[PDB]
Design a protein around this ligand. Structure first.
Ligand SMILES: *Cc1c(COP(=O)(O)O)cnc(C)c1O
Length: 470
Protein backbone atom coordinates (compact mmCIF):
# COMPACT_ATOMS: atom_id res chain seq x y z
CA UNK A 1 0.00 0.00 0.00
CA UNK A 2 1.11 3.61 -0.55
CA UNK A 3 1.15 5.81 2.57
CA UNK A 4 -2.17 7.18 1.50
CA UNK A 5 -3.65 3.96 0.41
CA UNK A 6 -2.70 2.97 4.00
CA UNK A 7 -4.46 6.05 5.34
CA UNK A 8 -7.66 5.12 3.51
CA UNK A 9 -7.25 1.66 5.05
CA UNK A 10 -6.25 3.14 8.40
CA UNK A 11 -9.53 4.98 8.93
CA UNK A 12 -11.58 1.94 7.92
CA UNK A 13 -9.75 -0.14 10.52
CA UNK A 14 -9.98 2.54 13.22
CA UNK A 15 -13.72 2.41 12.70
CA UNK A 16 -13.92 -1.38 12.82
CA UNK A 17 -11.96 -1.47 16.11
CA UNK A 18 -14.06 1.37 17.60
CA UNK A 19 -17.32 -0.51 16.91
CA UNK A 20 -15.80 -3.74 18.26
CA UNK A 21 -14.79 -2.21 21.63
CA UNK A 22 -18.24 -0.55 21.78
CA UNK A 23 -20.37 -3.65 21.13
CA UNK A 24 -18.11 -6.40 22.47
CA UNK A 25 -20.38 -7.29 25.41
CA UNK A 26 -23.01 -8.36 22.84
CA UNK A 27 -21.04 -11.34 21.82
CA UNK A 28 -20.33 -14.75 23.31
CA UNK A 29 -17.29 -14.22 25.56
CA UNK A 30 -15.64 -17.48 24.45
CA UNK A 31 -15.36 -18.65 20.84
CA UNK A 32 -18.13 -20.97 19.68
CA UNK A 33 -16.25 -22.72 16.88
CA UNK A 34 -14.74 -26.13 16.36
CA UNK A 35 -11.03 -26.95 15.92
CA UNK A 36 -10.20 -26.62 12.24
CA UNK A 37 -12.93 -24.12 11.34
CA UNK A 38 -10.50 -21.46 10.11
CA UNK A 39 -7.81 -23.59 8.42
CA UNK A 40 -10.58 -25.38 6.49
CA UNK A 41 -11.99 -21.94 5.63
CA UNK A 42 -8.74 -20.38 4.39
CA UNK A 43 -6.81 -20.93 1.14
CA UNK A 44 -4.01 -23.42 1.23
CA UNK A 45 -1.41 -21.02 -0.30
CA UNK A 46 -0.56 -17.34 -0.35
CA UNK A 47 -1.90 -15.37 -3.35
CA UNK A 48 0.38 -14.58 -6.27
CA UNK A 49 -0.94 -11.04 -6.79
CA UNK A 50 -2.17 -8.69 -4.12
CA UNK A 51 -5.83 -8.88 -3.00
CA UNK A 52 -7.99 -5.85 -2.11
CA UNK A 53 -8.15 -4.69 1.52
CA UNK A 54 -11.95 -4.90 1.50
CA UNK A 55 -11.46 -8.61 0.82
CA UNK A 56 -9.37 -8.98 3.97
CA UNK A 57 -11.85 -6.98 6.10
CA UNK A 58 -14.75 -9.12 4.87
CA UNK A 59 -12.66 -12.17 5.84
CA UNK A 60 -11.88 -10.36 9.11
CA UNK A 61 -15.59 -10.05 9.92
CA UNK A 62 -16.72 -13.40 8.49
CA UNK A 63 -13.87 -15.80 9.37
CA UNK A 64 -11.83 -14.20 12.16
CA UNK A 65 -14.45 -12.66 14.47
CA UNK A 66 -16.31 -15.97 15.20
CA UNK A 67 -13.04 -17.60 16.30
CA UNK A 68 -12.23 -15.07 19.01
CA UNK A 69 -12.56 -15.44 22.71
CA UNK A 70 -13.03 -11.82 23.80
CA UNK A 71 -10.63 -10.73 26.54
CA UNK A 72 -11.76 -7.10 26.54
CA UNK A 73 -15.45 -8.15 27.36
CA UNK A 74 -17.54 -6.98 30.36
CA UNK A 75 -18.29 -10.65 31.12
CA UNK A 76 -14.75 -12.05 30.83
CA UNK A 77 -13.62 -13.55 34.15
CA UNK A 78 -11.02 -16.08 33.03
CA UNK A 79 -7.37 -16.64 33.89
CA UNK A 80 -6.27 -13.16 34.78
CA UNK A 81 -7.26 -10.09 32.74
CA UNK A 82 -5.17 -9.07 29.70
CA UNK A 83 -6.14 -5.44 29.82
CA UNK A 84 -5.92 -3.15 26.82
CA UNK A 85 -6.80 0.46 27.51
CA UNK A 86 -7.54 2.23 24.22
CA UNK A 87 -4.99 4.91 25.15
CA UNK A 88 -2.28 2.23 25.22
CA UNK A 89 -3.65 0.71 22.00
CA UNK A 90 -3.16 4.21 20.54
CA UNK A 91 0.43 4.12 21.78
CA UNK A 92 0.90 0.79 20.00
CA UNK A 93 -0.35 2.14 16.68
CA UNK A 94 2.30 4.84 16.86
CA UNK A 95 5.07 2.40 17.73
CA UNK A 96 4.18 0.16 14.79
CA UNK A 97 3.57 2.92 12.23
CA UNK A 98 6.77 4.73 13.18
CA UNK A 99 8.76 1.59 12.46
CA UNK A 100 11.84 2.23 14.57
CA UNK A 101 13.93 -0.39 16.33
CA UNK A 102 16.09 -0.11 19.40
CA UNK A 103 19.31 -2.04 18.82
CA UNK A 104 21.16 0.77 20.64
CA UNK A 105 20.52 4.28 21.92
CA UNK A 106 21.71 5.79 18.64
CA UNK A 107 19.41 3.57 16.53
CA UNK A 108 16.62 5.76 18.10
CA UNK A 109 17.19 7.79 21.29
CA UNK A 110 13.54 8.57 21.93
CA UNK A 111 12.69 4.86 22.29
CA UNK A 112 15.15 4.09 25.06
CA UNK A 113 14.95 7.40 26.91
CA UNK A 114 11.15 7.26 26.98
CA UNK A 115 11.28 3.68 28.32
CA UNK A 116 13.74 4.91 30.94
CA UNK A 117 11.40 7.73 32.01
CA UNK A 118 8.11 5.78 32.02
CA UNK A 119 9.65 2.85 33.92
CA UNK A 120 10.88 5.32 36.56
CA UNK A 121 7.42 6.93 36.43
CA UNK A 122 5.83 3.57 37.32
CA UNK A 123 8.60 2.56 39.74
CA UNK A 124 7.49 5.52 41.87
CA UNK A 125 3.76 4.73 41.39
CA UNK A 126 4.37 1.23 42.79
CA UNK A 127 6.04 2.56 45.95
CA UNK A 128 9.48 1.16 45.13
CA UNK A 129 12.64 2.68 46.54
CA UNK A 130 15.23 4.50 44.47
CA UNK A 131 17.61 1.49 44.22
CA UNK A 132 15.25 -0.10 41.69
CA UNK A 133 15.65 0.30 37.95
CA UNK A 134 13.64 -1.54 35.29
CA UNK A 135 13.37 -2.72 31.67
CA UNK A 136 10.38 -3.90 29.61
CA UNK A 137 10.43 -7.61 28.80
CA UNK A 138 7.82 -9.30 26.66
CA UNK A 139 6.34 -11.53 29.41
CA UNK A 140 6.75 -12.48 33.06
CA UNK A 141 7.87 -15.90 31.77
CA UNK A 142 10.91 -14.35 30.06
CA UNK A 143 11.38 -12.12 33.13
CA UNK A 144 11.61 -15.02 35.56
CA UNK A 145 14.08 -16.72 33.20
CA UNK A 146 16.15 -13.51 33.21
CA UNK A 147 16.04 -13.62 37.03
CA UNK A 148 16.93 -17.33 37.31
CA UNK A 149 19.75 -16.89 34.81
CA UNK A 150 20.78 -13.91 36.99
CA UNK A 151 20.51 -16.13 40.08
CA UNK A 152 22.61 -18.87 38.48
CA UNK A 153 25.26 -16.36 37.47
CA UNK A 154 25.57 -14.89 40.97
CA UNK A 155 26.01 -18.22 42.76
CA UNK A 156 28.42 -19.65 40.15
CA UNK A 157 30.68 -16.50 39.92
CA UNK A 158 29.73 -15.93 36.24
CA UNK A 159 30.57 -19.44 35.00
CA UNK A 160 29.00 -18.64 31.64
CA UNK A 161 32.38 -17.25 30.52
CA UNK A 162 33.91 -20.53 31.74
CA UNK A 163 32.60 -24.08 32.02
CA UNK A 164 29.01 -23.01 32.50
CA UNK A 165 26.47 -25.11 34.35
CA UNK A 166 27.88 -28.63 33.76
CA UNK A 167 31.22 -27.83 35.40
CA UNK A 168 29.70 -26.83 38.74
CA UNK A 169 30.55 -29.24 41.59
CA UNK A 170 27.19 -28.89 43.38
CA UNK A 171 23.53 -28.98 42.25
CA UNK A 172 22.06 -25.48 42.16
CA UNK A 173 18.68 -25.56 43.95
CA UNK A 174 15.70 -23.27 43.31
CA UNK A 175 13.04 -22.90 46.00
CA UNK A 176 9.50 -21.99 44.93
CA UNK A 177 6.08 -22.15 46.56
CA UNK A 178 4.10 -25.25 45.58
CA UNK A 179 1.48 -22.84 44.16
CA UNK A 180 4.01 -20.88 42.06
CA UNK A 181 2.98 -20.49 38.39
CA UNK A 182 4.16 -23.11 35.91
CA UNK A 183 6.31 -20.47 34.17
CA UNK A 184 8.59 -20.41 37.25
CA UNK A 185 9.32 -24.12 36.85
CA UNK A 186 9.83 -23.87 33.09
CA UNK A 187 12.21 -20.94 33.55
CA UNK A 188 14.34 -23.01 35.92
CA UNK A 189 14.38 -25.81 33.34
CA UNK A 190 15.28 -23.56 30.39
CA UNK A 191 18.15 -22.22 32.52
CA UNK A 192 19.28 -25.83 33.05
CA UNK A 193 18.41 -26.41 36.70
CA UNK A 194 16.81 -29.86 36.43
CA UNK A 195 13.43 -30.84 37.87
CA UNK A 196 15.24 -32.67 40.69
CA UNK A 197 16.71 -29.32 41.71
CA UNK A 198 13.44 -27.41 42.14
CA UNK A 199 12.02 -28.00 45.61
CA UNK A 200 8.40 -27.01 46.07
CA UNK A 201 7.89 -25.47 49.52
CA UNK A 202 4.63 -26.44 51.27
CA UNK A 203 1.98 -23.80 51.87
CA UNK A 204 -0.24 -22.68 54.74
CA UNK A 205 -3.98 -22.26 55.32
CA UNK A 206 -3.93 -19.27 52.94
CA UNK A 207 -1.76 -21.16 50.40
CA UNK A 208 1.22 -18.89 51.14
CA UNK A 209 4.60 -20.63 51.43
CA UNK A 210 5.87 -21.38 54.95
CA UNK A 211 9.27 -19.67 55.52
CA UNK A 212 9.87 -22.30 58.20
CA UNK A 213 9.76 -24.91 55.43
CA UNK A 214 12.10 -22.85 53.22
CA UNK A 215 14.73 -22.73 55.98
CA UNK A 216 14.05 -26.40 56.57
CA UNK A 217 14.57 -27.26 52.90
CA UNK A 218 17.60 -24.96 52.75
CA UNK A 219 19.43 -26.54 55.69
CA UNK A 220 18.73 -30.01 54.32
CA UNK A 221 20.41 -29.30 50.96
CA UNK A 222 23.51 -27.88 52.67
CA UNK A 223 23.34 -31.09 54.72
CA UNK A 224 23.23 -32.89 51.39
CA UNK A 225 26.12 -31.05 49.77
CA UNK A 226 23.87 -29.40 47.24
CA UNK A 227 24.20 -25.62 46.75
CA UNK A 228 21.08 -23.50 47.29
CA UNK A 229 20.93 -20.71 44.67
CA UNK A 230 17.58 -18.85 44.48
CA UNK A 231 14.13 -18.37 46.00
CA UNK A 232 11.08 -17.42 43.89
CA UNK A 233 8.18 -15.92 45.87
CA UNK A 234 4.75 -15.17 44.41
CA UNK A 235 2.72 -12.08 45.32
CA UNK A 236 -0.65 -13.09 43.94
CA UNK A 237 -0.60 -16.68 42.81
CA UNK A 238 -2.57 -17.74 39.78
CA UNK A 239 -4.95 -20.12 41.52
CA UNK A 240 -6.04 -18.27 44.65
CA UNK A 241 -3.94 -15.04 44.51
CA UNK A 242 -2.03 -16.14 47.60
CA UNK A 243 0.55 -13.76 49.06
CA UNK A 244 3.96 -15.26 49.90
CA UNK A 245 5.37 -13.48 52.99
CA UNK A 246 8.38 -11.69 51.51
CA UNK A 247 9.94 -10.19 54.63
CA UNK A 248 10.63 -13.54 56.37
CA UNK A 249 11.51 -15.13 53.01
CA UNK A 250 13.74 -12.17 52.18
CA UNK A 251 15.59 -12.34 55.49
CA UNK A 252 16.20 -16.07 54.83
CA UNK A 253 17.44 -15.54 51.27
CA UNK A 254 19.69 -12.74 52.56
CA UNK A 255 21.13 -14.76 55.44
CA UNK A 256 22.03 -17.64 53.06
CA UNK A 257 23.36 -15.75 50.00
CA UNK A 258 20.51 -16.68 47.63
CA UNK A 259 18.67 -14.81 44.92
CA UNK A 260 15.19 -13.54 45.82
CA UNK A 261 13.15 -13.06 42.67
CA UNK A 262 9.51 -12.06 43.29
CA UNK A 263 6.78 -13.03 40.78
CA UNK A 264 4.29 -10.18 41.15
CA UNK A 265 2.93 -10.50 37.59
CA UNK A 266 -0.75 -10.14 38.38
CA UNK A 267 -0.95 -8.38 41.78
CA UNK A 268 1.94 -6.02 40.99
CA UNK A 269 -0.49 -3.47 39.53
CA UNK A 270 -2.36 -3.15 42.85
CA UNK A 271 0.81 -1.65 44.32
CA UNK A 272 -0.12 1.68 42.75
CA UNK A 273 -2.77 1.62 45.49
CA UNK A 274 -1.20 2.77 48.79
CA UNK A 275 -3.73 0.76 50.81
CA UNK A 276 -2.49 -2.53 49.25
CA UNK A 277 1.33 -2.32 49.71
CA UNK A 278 1.05 -4.43 52.87
CA UNK A 279 1.04 -7.25 50.30
CA UNK A 280 4.57 -6.29 49.27
CA UNK A 281 6.22 -5.93 52.64
CA UNK A 282 9.80 -7.16 52.44
CA UNK A 283 10.05 -6.47 48.69
CA UNK A 284 12.97 -4.12 49.41
CA UNK A 285 14.88 -7.26 50.37
CA UNK A 286 14.34 -8.81 46.91
CA UNK A 287 16.90 -8.89 44.09
CA UNK A 288 14.36 -8.74 41.24
CA UNK A 289 10.63 -8.21 40.74
CA UNK A 290 8.36 -8.50 37.72
CA UNK A 291 4.95 -6.92 37.16
CA UNK A 292 2.80 -7.36 34.07
CA UNK A 293 1.48 -3.95 33.17
CA UNK A 294 -0.15 -5.82 30.29
CA UNK A 295 -2.36 -7.77 32.72
CA UNK A 296 -4.51 -5.76 35.17
CA UNK A 297 -2.99 -2.25 34.98
CA UNK A 298 -4.18 -2.01 31.38
CA UNK A 299 -1.25 -1.55 28.95
CA UNK A 300 -1.79 -3.70 25.83
CA UNK A 301 0.20 -6.95 25.59
CA UNK A 302 3.21 -7.14 25.38
CA UNK A 303 4.65 -5.04 28.20
CA UNK A 304 6.29 -6.98 31.04
CA UNK A 305 8.22 -4.93 33.59
CA UNK A 306 11.33 -6.31 35.33
CA UNK A 307 13.01 -4.35 38.15
CA UNK A 308 16.44 -5.06 39.63
CA UNK A 309 18.36 -3.39 42.43
CA UNK A 310 21.66 -4.57 40.88
CA UNK A 311 21.50 -3.58 37.20
CA UNK A 312 25.28 -3.96 36.98
CA UNK A 313 24.78 -7.68 37.53
CA UNK A 314 22.03 -7.81 34.92
CA UNK A 315 24.26 -6.09 32.36
CA UNK A 316 27.20 -8.37 33.25
CA UNK A 317 25.15 -11.49 32.51
CA UNK A 318 23.17 -10.45 29.45
CA UNK A 319 26.11 -8.69 27.85
CA UNK A 320 28.13 -11.84 28.88
CA UNK A 321 30.74 -9.35 30.12
CA UNK A 322 31.23 -9.92 33.89
CA UNK A 323 34.15 -7.43 34.05
CA UNK A 324 31.64 -4.58 33.63
CA UNK A 325 31.43 -1.74 36.14
CA UNK A 326 28.47 0.67 36.13
CA UNK A 327 30.58 3.45 37.68
CA UNK A 328 33.34 3.46 35.05
CA UNK A 329 21.68 3.06 28.93
CA UNK A 330 21.65 0.12 26.45
CA UNK A 331 18.52 -2.00 26.98
CA UNK A 332 20.26 -4.53 24.74
CA UNK A 333 22.06 -5.52 27.98
CA UNK A 334 18.87 -5.64 30.09
CA UNK A 335 17.34 -8.83 28.70
CA UNK A 336 17.36 -11.57 26.11
CA UNK A 337 16.43 -9.65 22.90
CA UNK A 338 18.98 -7.24 21.53
CA UNK A 339 16.22 -5.39 19.67
CA UNK A 340 13.03 -3.83 20.92
CA UNK A 341 10.14 -1.95 19.47
CA UNK A 342 8.70 1.26 20.90
CA UNK A 343 6.64 -0.31 23.70
CA UNK A 344 7.38 2.73 25.88
CA UNK A 345 4.91 4.61 23.70
CA UNK A 346 2.21 2.36 25.15
CA UNK A 347 3.07 3.01 28.80
CA UNK A 348 3.54 6.71 28.12
CA UNK A 349 0.14 7.13 26.45
CA UNK A 350 -1.72 5.16 29.13
CA UNK A 351 -0.03 6.75 32.15
CA UNK A 352 -0.76 10.18 30.63
CA UNK A 353 -4.18 9.91 28.97
CA UNK A 354 -5.91 8.10 31.87
CA UNK A 355 -4.08 9.57 34.88
CA UNK A 356 -3.17 7.91 38.19
CA UNK A 357 -6.59 8.96 39.50
CA UNK A 358 -8.38 6.80 36.91
CA UNK A 359 -6.01 3.84 37.24
CA UNK A 360 -6.50 3.77 40.99
CA UNK A 361 -10.32 3.87 40.85
CA UNK A 362 -10.44 1.05 38.29
CA UNK A 363 -8.33 -1.39 40.31
CA UNK A 364 -10.17 -0.42 43.49
CA UNK A 365 -13.27 -1.11 41.42
CA UNK A 366 -12.24 -4.69 40.67
CA UNK A 367 -11.26 -5.17 44.34
CA UNK A 368 -14.60 -3.85 45.57
CA UNK A 369 -16.59 -5.92 43.04
CA UNK A 370 -14.79 -9.11 44.13
CA UNK A 371 -15.71 -8.43 47.75
CA UNK A 372 -19.34 -8.05 46.62
CA UNK A 373 -19.52 -11.37 44.78
CA UNK A 374 -17.69 -13.13 47.63
CA UNK A 375 -20.38 -11.88 50.01
CA UNK A 376 -23.21 -13.33 47.94
CA UNK A 377 -21.29 -16.59 47.42
CA UNK A 378 -20.55 -16.96 51.13
CA UNK A 379 -24.22 -16.49 52.05
CA UNK A 380 -25.98 -18.43 49.28
CA UNK A 381 -26.58 -21.93 50.52
CA UNK A 382 -24.88 -24.77 48.62
CA UNK A 383 -22.19 -22.29 47.50
CA UNK A 384 -18.77 -21.77 49.04
CA UNK A 385 -15.57 -19.75 48.60
CA UNK A 386 -12.46 -21.89 48.98
CA UNK A 387 -9.75 -19.25 49.53
CA UNK A 388 -9.32 -15.69 50.82
CA UNK A 389 -10.30 -12.80 48.55
CA UNK A 390 -7.22 -10.59 49.13
CA UNK A 391 -7.23 -9.40 45.51
CA UNK A 392 -9.97 -9.60 42.86
CA UNK A 393 -10.09 -13.37 42.26
CA UNK A 394 -12.57 -15.81 43.88
CA UNK A 395 -12.26 -19.59 44.14
CA UNK A 396 -15.87 -20.81 44.22
CA UNK A 397 -17.74 -24.12 44.02
CA UNK A 398 -21.36 -25.27 44.27
CA UNK A 399 -22.11 -28.25 46.53
CA UNK A 400 -25.17 -30.43 45.83
CA UNK A 401 -26.09 -32.20 49.03
CA UNK A 402 -24.39 -35.58 49.35
CA UNK A 403 -22.10 -35.00 46.35
CA UNK A 404 -18.46 -35.71 47.13
CA UNK A 405 -15.23 -36.54 45.37
CA UNK A 406 -15.05 -37.46 41.68
CA UNK A 407 -18.79 -36.97 41.16
CA UNK A 408 -18.51 -33.39 42.42
CA UNK A 409 -15.41 -32.81 40.26
CA UNK A 410 -17.60 -33.85 37.32
CA UNK A 411 -20.44 -31.63 38.57
CA UNK A 412 -18.07 -28.65 38.78
CA UNK A 413 -16.42 -28.67 35.35
CA UNK A 414 -19.77 -29.70 33.90
CA UNK A 415 -21.50 -26.51 34.87
CA UNK A 416 -18.27 -24.56 34.23
CA UNK A 417 -18.21 -25.81 30.64
CA UNK A 418 -21.96 -25.23 30.35
CA UNK A 419 -21.71 -21.57 31.50
CA UNK A 420 -18.76 -20.91 29.14
CA UNK A 421 -20.59 -22.51 26.17
CA UNK A 422 -23.69 -20.38 26.72
CA UNK A 423 -21.80 -17.17 25.87
CA UNK A 424 -22.76 -15.36 29.07
CA UNK A 425 -19.37 -15.46 30.79
CA UNK A 426 -15.80 -16.78 30.63
CA UNK A 427 -14.56 -18.74 33.71
CA UNK A 428 -11.42 -20.88 34.20
CA UNK A 429 -11.85 -24.17 36.08
CA UNK A 430 -8.80 -24.97 38.20
CA UNK A 431 -7.79 -27.45 40.92
CA UNK A 432 -7.28 -26.69 44.60
CA UNK A 433 -6.26 -29.25 47.25
CA UNK A 434 -6.98 -32.21 44.97
CA UNK A 435 -10.49 -30.97 44.07
CA UNK A 436 -11.82 -29.07 41.08
CA UNK A 437 -13.26 -25.59 41.57
CA UNK A 438 -13.93 -22.61 39.29
CA UNK A 439 -12.15 -19.26 39.16
CA UNK A 440 -13.79 -15.90 38.69
CA UNK A 441 -11.13 -13.28 37.84
CA UNK A 442 -12.67 -9.83 37.89
CA UNK A 443 -10.88 -7.07 36.01
CA UNK A 444 -11.59 -6.94 32.29
CA UNK A 445 -11.71 -3.22 31.49
CA UNK A 446 -15.51 -2.73 31.27
CA UNK A 447 -16.49 -5.05 34.18
CA UNK A 448 -18.54 -2.93 36.58
CA UNK A 449 -20.95 -3.75 39.38
CA UNK A 450 -23.84 -4.24 36.95
CA UNK A 451 -21.98 -6.97 35.06
CA UNK A 452 -20.87 -8.79 38.22
CA UNK A 453 -24.45 -8.89 39.50
CA UNK A 454 -25.49 -10.56 36.23
CA UNK A 455 -22.64 -13.07 36.48
CA UNK A 456 -23.90 -14.00 39.93
CA UNK A 457 -27.34 -14.63 38.38
CA UNK A 458 -26.01 -16.74 35.50
CA UNK A 459 -23.95 -18.77 37.98
CA UNK A 460 -27.03 -19.71 40.05
CA UNK A 461 -29.16 -20.39 36.96
CA UNK A 462 -26.63 -22.56 35.11
CA UNK A 463 -26.99 -25.11 37.90
CA UNK A 464 -30.77 -25.20 37.60
CA UNK A 465 -30.30 -25.89 33.89
CA UNK A 466 -30.94 -22.30 32.76
CA UNK A 467 -28.47 -20.89 30.19
CA UNK A 468 -28.62 -17.48 28.49
CA UNK A 469 -27.87 -16.62 24.84
CA UNK A 470 -27.54 -13.19 23.34
C1 LIG B 1 0.36 -14.56 34.33
C2 LIG B 1 1.43 -14.85 35.35
C3 LIG B 1 2.62 -15.43 34.94
C4 LIG B 1 2.89 -15.57 33.46
O1 LIG B 1 3.26 -14.32 32.93
P1 LIG B 1 3.35 -14.10 31.34
O2 LIG B 1 3.49 -12.62 31.07
O3 LIG B 1 2.08 -14.60 30.69
O4 LIG B 1 4.53 -14.85 30.79
C5 LIG B 1 3.54 -15.87 35.88
N1 LIG B 1 3.27 -15.73 37.23
C6 LIG B 1 2.09 -15.16 37.64
C7 LIG B 1 1.80 -15.01 39.11
C8 LIG B 1 1.16 -14.71 36.71
O5 LIG B 1 -0.01 -14.14 37.13
Amino acid sequence: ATPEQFRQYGHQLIDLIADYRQTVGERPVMAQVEPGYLKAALPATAPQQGEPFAAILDDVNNLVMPGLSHWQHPDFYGYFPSNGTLSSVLGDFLSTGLGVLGLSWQSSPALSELEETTLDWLRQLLGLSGQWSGVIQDTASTSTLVALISARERATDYALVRGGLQAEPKPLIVYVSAHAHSSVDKAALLAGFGRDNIRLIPTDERYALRPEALQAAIEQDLAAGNQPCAVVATTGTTTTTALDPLRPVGEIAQANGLWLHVDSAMAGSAMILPECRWMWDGIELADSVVVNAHKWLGVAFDCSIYYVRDPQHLIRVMSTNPSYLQSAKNLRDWGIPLGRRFRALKLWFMLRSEGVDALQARLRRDLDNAQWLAGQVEAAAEWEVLAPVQLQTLCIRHRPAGLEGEALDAHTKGWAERLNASGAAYVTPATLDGRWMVRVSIGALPTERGDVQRLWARLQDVIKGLEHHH
